[PDB]
């Protein structure tokens, strides 16, 4: 079937055509050495590294390049090989510095281990080296650039996933070299990839500088909690303490890439933090107390409430076993207002039917849908691996995008219509220029972001959206396995409150006021004492100080991601775990033990011990939460639809901005982003 | 020395010292690394 | 006191035809009787399908769904509702 | 000779150490170089094996001449970057001296 | 150099002290707190930069061997100076 | 060449005659005979052939492997029978030394064979008290290397290197006693293996 | 290279312990008769294979060429 | 001379660890990640079991970090799953799983960066 | 499945094999309080072997209860020869060291003891 049989070493593989040398190694096993390649970029022949031996021919090709013929017997281990492969180390050590000692990037280095399998054991080069201008090109990014091998990674990288086209070569010959012209500097929110891509230590980070070395590190594997997408990240830790953070391969959802602010928002975790149970004092200041004192004056207090006097808020970065607890205790006392601190409508269908407040095109079927519609969002700045995907379209199979809101700086370019909604109603009527597109166009796609429903005109454009995306799905035809509605969160903990059943939004705690909140990661600053009566008994319980705990009357300390095994959801409803790397400082605990614990204390003991029960008790409360890496197909879009079509609400004139409009507001979005003292130096930088 | 003197360089002791095992100039150990985590500390004023 | 009716469910299975058979024929007309009520959908794959109706001070209900036809998880469905 | 240190925290020594004696800790410093914030020796877990000064590339830590150096306490032995220093100091005139003579053999 | 806390306690050449309110300051009491007083971070200052009339310095430290691996340095920068990542020596171009 | 070792192909060639030898004549009781690039010879075999294997080689006339230069066992957790055994055995007559192998795994003992060399009774209770193997009709089989109420066999793959338990005086008893382990320096685990393929010979398929 | 030199080996006749005391005291004599022979018989030349994959190189190769370095680095980390 | 016995396998009685440690764990077998920082690939061909991290404090002497938990840095080698799910069960210990995350195959053309048509042309050689 | 059995056909005959065993032990029990002057009682001993027998009681494997057999031999051979001592013997009760307490709360207050 268009197949082709080609021989490595003598066996026989079944390959596609147009596929290459080094691919047909892979699909064996045997793996070609490496410097210019790799899977995610384009291709170049620069490094000469891959240089292998065709039977029946004088010259040696280039397995990054040369595509298989048929018939074709490739050798691999051969005395050609290796001798092309000893010569282009001579070669690329040649006017290496001396700097393996000092490089971070040295228990680490391709070019070590590659110089020590395929290279030779000495030198005859007794000649002079050369040395290099450093440039400076961020607060992020270290560039000592006598040790690049112009292997071109970084600029191809930039020109395509990151779509900035600001690195490139300057020059010509040995005196050639890598970087900008002129002082620019690197600050995307994709900066900070370079330096995983680049086989050396020429760009390394500047916060991780010095302190550690590869074979100390233990390694994780575990989560971001950052955004809403669920970036499968690894971190590194040595004697109990977070060194860095690392992406880590699912090709689902980030396929190697991680954020910017992710991998350098390690330090947040490392100030302002909450260490031990506080109390407010008689001379009404905080004062430190123990777990007992704590627990106890906060179930004295329970016990003198019930009923809608009783709240719960929660924000961004909390576990769904917190949240399940919380609920399983406030159900208890009677007192279902758990609200969070993130909107999502709560009229029509609402928080009823999971093929809503998700997206139901997986992250994935970017690559396969033809038209995109982005509604008042700046995906570059939250989720930006989405923008990533959907560049990588918009490079590869030729996609389609437009979006209705405010002017943005995408990394590509996208077609505009206005920043008002009512386009919204213009398309669905047929008065636009873009039913043209959308009639022609199979697979469209049509995304929403909680940004502009955080607005009070929220459900309205909503509701024009969901009539939209049936006017299109019954003028260009689509299957009902295809999904063309999609909605976007910035928040990490959303999905899993809403599919636990909270009710997404404030509304009621200003409807109801409260006499006793429980606030738990809400350092956001909606909700104020002046908003409350006079005597609201708050319990904040959090990782950080920065808006909500000054403000509070007990404090308990928890723990943050790093220090937890706790169950997280992405806008895909993709379950994931984190896992524990580092214990929480001093008497730090857990969420779910610390609310287990207050019951027992009360005496409404929950039948919750251990993390496995918790996990049972998610189960029950919803299945999903337990088949992890794994998405549920949702088929009820169009009872949805058929309810939100009765919801009379006119939307309004102001047009809908994103609130991160530039890369000056993607840093510090949250707590540890505020406490990171890099975050900042990013800023200042940009500034 | 008299004939083959060492090199004549700073931050080399002019004084010797002897063991002092027990002696109060003794040598205790300890950390030389500062502290790590930093703790969270509220105003002196409420509310 | 009913606080919150949750059915889960499952897909290409026949215990949870006749909960699919409901859902499209009788839940938009529920809501809107009971608008304010917290009817929490939550299908996954390989599910026994419950109904857990949850009451007011902690407690609540569960019913096997399995094998059931449409018109029989309307009367489950009254029965608990009632 | 300029008074500068040599261990540039390469952590090899750290590395080789058979009896995991070696704790290192390094950082940037203020001057923007690579220099160890902390560099403790257990010598009741060395076995006084040279491996550490065979690895230096820039010949900083030396198993010097001295063996006089017993204690009462089982805390005098757990030295330190002061304490290594210290003894650099106090050792140099000597193990210049010997390191000149042996180290064409190595 | 070595100038005291509060407390009374000598800080080191990075910055260690037990804060006042710390217990573990027992270990020094009858007895002393180790310390170093030749800072390499103002040795390394006292000393000048070299001057070169080329563009690219090779540094060893001294002896061929006895110094550390040859690094070579680039002098195009008249801004500042080209600093050795081993011994700390600058050079300038002239 | 000065670097590499050289290589004789005689004694190659008489091993691998050796093995086809011992394997016609056991072709019960015999599996995976294996001649290696330096020269040794390996018989692997069941856990009913030690005896029958072992009395062969000493006493056949061509044979005559009298010593027993070792008893040893080998902890491969990834396999059902977990525990290899190996007999390293040596020739006088001839010069030469062989290797016979079985396996065996935890509740799946080995037959002894002390009636064939008696210097197995204590390496056979040192396999028993480090890697939890017992062995049939062995005289004394107790604790030889081990303190007298270890509860544990360290050798093992899962067993952890410092241990479960620690030891030191208190005064209040009067004794040495035993506790959890709580150490002041958490041994380092090092992660070395490079990432990169150092020997393709051994490549195997995916 | 004990198949370039020559000694004695002796053997007893009772395996008692005073057979076994004679044999110890003329196996330090025949190691003397081989200390003469390899003294004279010193060769010059390398002391370790020149294979820098299994033995470090020297320093000063150690610290003016790159292959030399790196393979000091992979060898004793 | 053979016996049926069909019931679950167990030795954790002959294991000798206690119960402490063979019941309140939990242990995790998967195929490490492949380091972003380097492109080899013999690392992610053999599955591994490690165990749950604990606390890991500091030293008031020295600063060192001290444990209590003497099954931190074990860490076993398996060349499939289900010997590593056999192994977990024999001993006891409640164990997750992580399937082996597999790299796509992908389509490239070095061709495809000088179209005369596309977008994958590329503006730097 | 099938298996090649050890010391023992079924359940029966390895539990009159470990009533033998415990008959050897109750017994022996006083001789070494008295032997090494220990300071407990022998019903303290007694109570002892019973909870280091039921212990291991879930067990259903022939094998591993014949294994456990003789481990108690060389026990108990280890014992009734005095190769142990007061310490060995002793290293029973745990008379040095307060157990982890079986209560969420006493676990939680102090540390992270799941
Ligand atoms: S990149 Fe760094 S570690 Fe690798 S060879 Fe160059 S200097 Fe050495
Ligand atoms: S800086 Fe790094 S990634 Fe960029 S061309 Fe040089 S070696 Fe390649
Ligand atoms: S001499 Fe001592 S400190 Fe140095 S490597 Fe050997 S054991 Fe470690
Ligand atoms: S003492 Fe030497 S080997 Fe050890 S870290 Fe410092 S420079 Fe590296
Ligand atoms: S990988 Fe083929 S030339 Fe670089
Ligand atoms: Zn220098």
Redo the contacts between chains.
């Keep these: 079937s268009n197949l082709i049989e080609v021989f490595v070493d003598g066996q026989s593989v079944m390959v596609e055509p147009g596929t290459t040398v080094l691919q047909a190694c892979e699909k064996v096993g045997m793996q070609i050495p490496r410097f210019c390649y790799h899977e995610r970029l384009s291709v170049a022949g620069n490094c000469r590294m891959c240089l292998v031996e065709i039977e029946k021919a004088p010259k040696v090709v280039a397995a990054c390049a040369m595509p298989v013929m048929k018939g074709w017997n490739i050798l691999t281990n051969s005395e050609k090989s290796k001798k092309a492969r000893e010569g282009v180390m001579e070669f690329l050590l040649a006017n290496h510095p001396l700097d393996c000692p000092i490089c971070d990037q040295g228990g680490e280095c391709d070019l070590q281990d590659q110089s020590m399998m395929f290279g030779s054991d000495r030198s005859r080069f007794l000649e002079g080296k050369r040395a290099v201008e450093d440039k400076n090109i961020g607060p992020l990014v270290k560039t000592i650039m006598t040790r690049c091998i112009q292997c071109t990674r970084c600029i191809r990288f930039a020109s395509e996933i990151a779509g900035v086209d600001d690195l490139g070569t300057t020059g010509r010959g040995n005196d050639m070299q890598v970087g900008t012209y002129i002082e620019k500097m690197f600050m995307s929110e994709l900066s900070g990839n370079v330096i995983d891509i680049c086989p050396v230590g020429a760009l390394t980070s500047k916060p991780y500088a010095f302190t550690a070395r590869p074979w100390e590190t233990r390694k994780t594997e575990s989560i971001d909690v950052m955004d809403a997408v669920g970036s499968n990240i690894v971190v590194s830790t040595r004697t109990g303490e977070v060194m860095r953070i690392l992406p880590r391969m699912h090709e689902d959802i980030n396929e190697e890439w991680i954020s910017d602010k992710t991998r350098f928002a390690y330090d947040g975790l490392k100030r302002q933090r909450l260490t031990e149970p506080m109390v407010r004092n008689e001379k009404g200041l905080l004062t430190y107390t123990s777990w007992e004192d704590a627990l106890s004056r906060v179930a004295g207090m329970l016990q003198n409430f019930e009923g809608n006097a009783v709240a719960a808020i929660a924000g961004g970065l909390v576990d769904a076993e917190a949240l399940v607890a919380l609920k399983?205790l406030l159900?208890?006392?009677?007192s279902?207002n758990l609200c969070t601190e993130e909107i999502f409508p709560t009229e029509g269908?609402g928080?009823?039917?999971?093929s809503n407040y998700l997206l139901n095109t997986t992250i994935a079927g970017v690559e396969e849908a033809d038209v995109v519609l982005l509604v008042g969002t700046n995906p570059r700045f939250e989720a930006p691996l989405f923008n990533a995907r959907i560049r990588k379209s918009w490079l590869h199979n030729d996609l389609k995008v437009a979006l209705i809101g405010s002017p943005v700086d995408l990394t590509y370019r996208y077609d505009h219509l206005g920043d008002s909604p009512k386009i919204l109603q213009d398309i669905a009527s047929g008065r636009h220029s873009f039913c043209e597109v959308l009639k022609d166009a199979k697979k469209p796609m049509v995304v929403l972001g909680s940004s502009a429903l955080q607005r009070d005109d929220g459900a309205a454009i909503l509701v024009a959206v969901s009539n939209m995306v049936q006017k299109i799905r019954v003028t260009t035809g689509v299957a009902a396995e295809w999904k063309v509605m999609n909605i976007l969160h910035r928040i990490a903990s959303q999905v899993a409150a809403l599919?636990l059943?909270y009710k997404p939004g404030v509304e009621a705690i200003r409807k109801n006021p409260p006499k006793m909140l429980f606030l738990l990661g809400a350092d956001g600053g909606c909700i104020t004492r002046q908003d409350l009566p006079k005597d609201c008994f708050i319990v904040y319980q959090g990782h950080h100080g920065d808006v909500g705990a000054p403000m509070a009357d007990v404090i308990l300390p928890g723990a943050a991601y790093t220090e937890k095994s706790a169950t997280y959801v992405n806008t895909e409803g993709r379950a994931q775990q984190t896992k524990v790397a580092v214990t929480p400082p001093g008497l730090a605990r857990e969420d779910w033990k610390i609310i287990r614990a207050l019951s027992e204390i009360a005496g409404?003991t929950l039948p919750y011990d251990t993390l496995d029960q918790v996990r049972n008790r998610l189960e029950?409360?919803?299945?999903?939460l337990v088949?992890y890496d794994?998405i549920?197909?949702?088929?009820?879009f169009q009872?949805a639809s058929?309810?939100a079509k009765?919801v009379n609400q006119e939307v309004l004139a102001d047009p809908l901005v994103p609130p991160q409009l530039t890369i000056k507001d993607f840093y510090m979005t949250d707590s540890i982003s505020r406490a990171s003292q890099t975050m900042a130096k990013c800023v200042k930088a940009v500034t | 020395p008299t004939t083959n003197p060492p090199t004549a360089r700073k931050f080399i002791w002019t004084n010797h010292k002897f063991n002092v095992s027990a002696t109060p100039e003794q040598y205790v150990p300890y950390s030389t690394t500062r502290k790590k985590i930093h703790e969270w500390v509220p105003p002196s004023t409420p509310y | 006191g009913l606080?919150?009716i949750?059915v889960?469910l499952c897909?290409r299975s026949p215990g949870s035809q006749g909960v699919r058979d409901f859902?499209?024929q009788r839940?938009?007309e529920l809501?809107?009787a009971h608008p304010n009520l917290?009817?929490?959908?939550?299908?996954?794959?390989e599910?026994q399908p419950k109904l857990?109706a949850?009451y007011?001070?902690?407690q609540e209900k569960t019913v096997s769904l399995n094998n059931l036809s449409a018109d029989e998880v309307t009367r489950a469905m009254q029965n608990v509702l009632s | 000779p300029s008074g500068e240190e040599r261990c540039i925290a390469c952590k090899l020594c750290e590395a080789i150490c058979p009896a995991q004696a070696i704790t290192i800790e390094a950082e940037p410093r203020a001057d923007g170089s690579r220099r160890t914030t902390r560099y403790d020796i257990d010598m009741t877990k060395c076995i006084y094996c040279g491996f550490c000064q065979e690895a230096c590339p820039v010949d900083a830590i030396v198993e010097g001449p001295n063996f006089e150096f017993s204690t009462e306490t089982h805390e005098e032995l757990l030295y330190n970057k002061e304490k290594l220093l210290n003894n650099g100091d106090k050792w140099e005139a000597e193990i210049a001296a010997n390191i000149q003579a042996d180290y064409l053999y190595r | 150099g070595v100038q005291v806390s509060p407390s009374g306690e000598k800080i080191t050449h990075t910055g260690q002290v037990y804060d006042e309110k710390d217990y573990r300051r027992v270990r020094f009491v009858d007895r002393q707190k180790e310390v170093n007083e030749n800072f390499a971070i103002d040795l390394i200052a006292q000393q000048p930069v070299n001057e070169v009339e080329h563009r690219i310095i090779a540094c060893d430290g001294g002896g061929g061997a006895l110094g550390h691996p040859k690094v070579y340095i680039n002098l195009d920068k008249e801004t500042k100076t080209g600093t050795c990542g081993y011994c700390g020596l600058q050079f300038k171009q002239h | 060449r000065p670097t590499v070792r050289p290589r004789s192909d005689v004694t190659h060639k008489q091993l691998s005659a050796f093995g086809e030898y011992v394997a016609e004549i056991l072709p019960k009781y015999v599996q995976q005979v294996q001649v290696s690039c330096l020269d040794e010879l390996e018989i692997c075999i069941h856990p009913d052939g030690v005896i029958p294997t072992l009395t062969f080689l000493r006493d056949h006339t061509n044979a005559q492997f009298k010593s027993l230069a070792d008893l040893t066992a080998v902890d491969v957790p990834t396999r059902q029978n977990r525990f290899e055994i190996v007999y390293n055995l040596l020739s006088l007559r001839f010069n030469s030394r062989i290797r016979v192998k079985t396996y065996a795994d935890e509740l799946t003992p080995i037959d002894s064979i002390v009636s064939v060399h008696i210097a197995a009774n204590w390496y056979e209770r040192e396999v028993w008290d480090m890697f939890g193997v017992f062995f049939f009709n062995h005289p004394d089989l107790r604790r030889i290397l081990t303190d007298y109420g270890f509860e544990g066999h360290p050798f093992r793959k899962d067993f952890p290197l410092t241990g479960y338990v620690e030891l030191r005086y208190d005064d209040e008893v009067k004794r040495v006693v035993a506790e959890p382990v709580e150490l002041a320096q958490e041994f380092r685990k090092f992660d070395l293996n490079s990432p990169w393929e150092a020997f393709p010979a051994y490549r195997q398929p995916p | 290279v004990y198949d370039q030199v020559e000694f004695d080996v002796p053997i007893g006749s009772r395996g008692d312990c005073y057979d076994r005391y004679l044999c110890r005291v003329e196996e330090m004599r025949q190691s003397l008769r081989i200390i003469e022979q390899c003294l004279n018989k010193m060769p010059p030349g390398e002391i370790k294979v020149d294979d820098a994959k299994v033995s470090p190189p020297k320093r000063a190769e150690m610290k003016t060429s790159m292959e030399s370095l790196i393979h000091h680095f992979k060898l004793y980390t | 001379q053979l016996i049926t016995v069909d019931e679950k396998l167990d030795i954790t009685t002959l294991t000798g660890v206690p119960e402490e440690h063979i019941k309140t764990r939990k242990v995790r077998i998967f195929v490490p990640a492949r380091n972003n920082m380097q492109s080899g690939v013999n690392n992610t061909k053999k599955w591994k079991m490690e165990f749950d991290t604990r606390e890991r404090w500091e030293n008031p002497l020295m600063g060192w970090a001290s444990t209590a938990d003497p099954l931190s840095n074990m860490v076993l080698t398996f060349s499939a799953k289900e010997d590593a799910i056999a192994f977990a069960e024999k001993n006891g210990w409640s164990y997750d799983v992580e399937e082996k995350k597999v790299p796509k195959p992908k389509s490239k053309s070095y061709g495809a960066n000088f179209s005369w048509n596309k977008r994958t042309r590329v503006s730097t050689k | 499945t099938s298996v090649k059995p050890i010391f023992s056909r079924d359940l029966n005959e390895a539990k009159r094999r470990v009533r033998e065993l415990y008959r050897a032990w109750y017994r022996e029990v006083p001789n070494t309080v008295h032997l090494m002057q220990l300071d407990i009682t022998v019903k303290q001993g007694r109570d002892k072997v019973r909870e280091m027998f039921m212990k291991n009681a879930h067990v259903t494997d022939p094998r591993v209860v014949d294994l456990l057999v003789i481990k108690g031999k060389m026990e108990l051979q280890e014992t009734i020869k005095v190769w142990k001592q007061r310490t060995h013997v002793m290293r029973f009760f745990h008379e040095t060291e307060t157990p982890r307490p079986k209560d969420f709360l006493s676990k939680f207050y102090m540390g992270h003891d799941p």
Excluded at chain 3, 38 to 45: F, G, N, Q
């Design positions: 399983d159900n208890k006392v009677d279902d269908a928080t009823d039917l999971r599919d059943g409404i029950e409360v919803s299945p999903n088949r794994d549920e197909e949702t088929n009820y009872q058929e309810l009765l | 606080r919150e949750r889960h897909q859902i499209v839940y938009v809501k809107k917290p009817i929490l959908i939550r299908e996954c794959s599910v857990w949850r007011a001070f902690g």
